[PDB]
């Protein structure tokens, strides 16, 4: 089943995808061993976009977003400068 994930990066926007492929390569080595695409789609494996920037002077401080059921830790981003860019496939 598909998934959404998040990436903090201190590098620039354009160079970040090539390092993401290097990180992401064991997730793509498991594909295509058991499946082979017909009806041709599926050659794309995920896509990345920019959410924006934030200040690295104050780092992310983990806090506790709790429901009444259980506990759930969360990464807090303070002084975020939001900028939605376009989808870039891998």
């Amino acid at each position: 089943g598909p998934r959404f994930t998040f990436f903090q990066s201190s590098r620039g926007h354009c160079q970040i995808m090539n390092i993401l492929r290097i990180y992401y390569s064991p997730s793509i080595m498991h594909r295509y061993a058991v499946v082979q695409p017909l009806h041709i789609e599926e050659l794309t494996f995920g896509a990345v976009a920019c959410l924006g920037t934030f200040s690295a002077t104050d780092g992310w401080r983990r806090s506790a977003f709790n429901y009444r059921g259980s506990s759930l830790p969360v990464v807090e981003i303070d002084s975020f400068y939001s900028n939605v860019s376009d989808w870039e496939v891998i």
Binding site: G12, C14, N18, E41, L43, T44, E88, I90
Partner: protein, 297 residues
């Protein structure tokens, strides 16, 4: 908002180099965040390493650039690059490039030789080489030329009867400009990161060769069998065997749409790969005094 970031040296800058740093005023230098080392490109491009122009490309693209405007002894003032401000940049680089095109600007590693961008600093244990500033079409042409050279010089070295080593160094060779041809600096081994870039490029290539729109094959066959175009000069009235053997099937339209869909998405991904290195949008480069208002795109 602040732009003024002062950087101290650590020892007395000698008066022989204050003259040339007076000569290099308004140039661009890569930052580290202060300190003295790495404020420049000597730490990743030294004499010891073969210049791969890709790891230093990684460092200049990954780090925010900086303008050097004032040099004094034991203190020199820098100015960062933050998007939204229209920086004044002077083209002060010995391989000259007039910005008659007035296009978008591009920064590149010193591929035009070590001497043209270096400066010796006998005060401390730091030497500075400078990033090259050059327009968009020359930058992308020299980029594809240095990648094609580091991928084909190695296979020419792989040839046992390598009768022609100097064939690519004079055909590929210099750079394409109407004013002059300007010979560049050429590595012999591509380095690791260069082969990583060719690896991802060949990955995109072998993914995109699995889908070709078959109608276009018929068009280039018909135009070859029409008059030979000036754009068709690279064929010199010849049909390659491969396009003759991938046209055994007929012309369809159903697979053509999804073919073109994945081709748009992978060409935009390839453009995102080749829009690498920080870019400048130019408004009104003034010709008579060699200065340009530019902001970070």
């Amino acid at each position: 908002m602040d732009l003024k970031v002062v950087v101290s040296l650590s020892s007395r800058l000698y008066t022989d180099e204050i003259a040339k740093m007076q000569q290099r005023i308004g140039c661009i230098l890569p930052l580290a965040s202060q300190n003295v080392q790495g404020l420049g490109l000597g730490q990743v491009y030294s004499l010891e390493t073969v210049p791969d122009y890709v790891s230093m490309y990684n460092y200049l693209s990954d780090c925010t650039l900086a303008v050097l405007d004032e040099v004094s002894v034991d203190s020199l003032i820098l100015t960062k690059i933050v998007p939204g401000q229209t920086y004044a940049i002077k083209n002060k680089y010995q391989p000259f490039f007039q910005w008659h095109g007035t296009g978008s600007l591009s920064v590149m590693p010193p591929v035009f030789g070590r001497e043209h961008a270096t400066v010796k600093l006998e005060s401390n244990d730091v030497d500075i080489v400078f990033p090259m500033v050059l327009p968009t079409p020359i930058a992308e042409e020299v980029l594809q030329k240095i990648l094609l050279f580091n991928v084909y010089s190695r296979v020419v070295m792989q040839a046992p009867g390598n009768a022609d080593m100097l064939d690519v160094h004079m055909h590929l060779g210099s750079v394409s400009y109407l004013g002059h041809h300007y010979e560049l600096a050429l590595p012999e081994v591509p380095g690791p990161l260069g082969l990583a870039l060719l690896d991802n490029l060949s990955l995109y290539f072998c993914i995109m060769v699995t889908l070709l729109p078959r109608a276009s094959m018929r068009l280039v066959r018909g135009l070859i069998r029409h008059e030979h175009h000036d754009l068709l000069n690279l064929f010199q009235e010849m049909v390659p065997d491969e396009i003759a053997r991938i046209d055994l099937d007929d012309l369809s339209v159903a697979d053509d749409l999804s073919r073109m869909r994945v081709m748009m998405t992978y060409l935009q991904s390839l453009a995102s790969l080749f829009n690498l290195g920080p870019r400048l949008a130019t408004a009104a480069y003034s010709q008579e005094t060699l200065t340009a208002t530019c902001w970070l795109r």
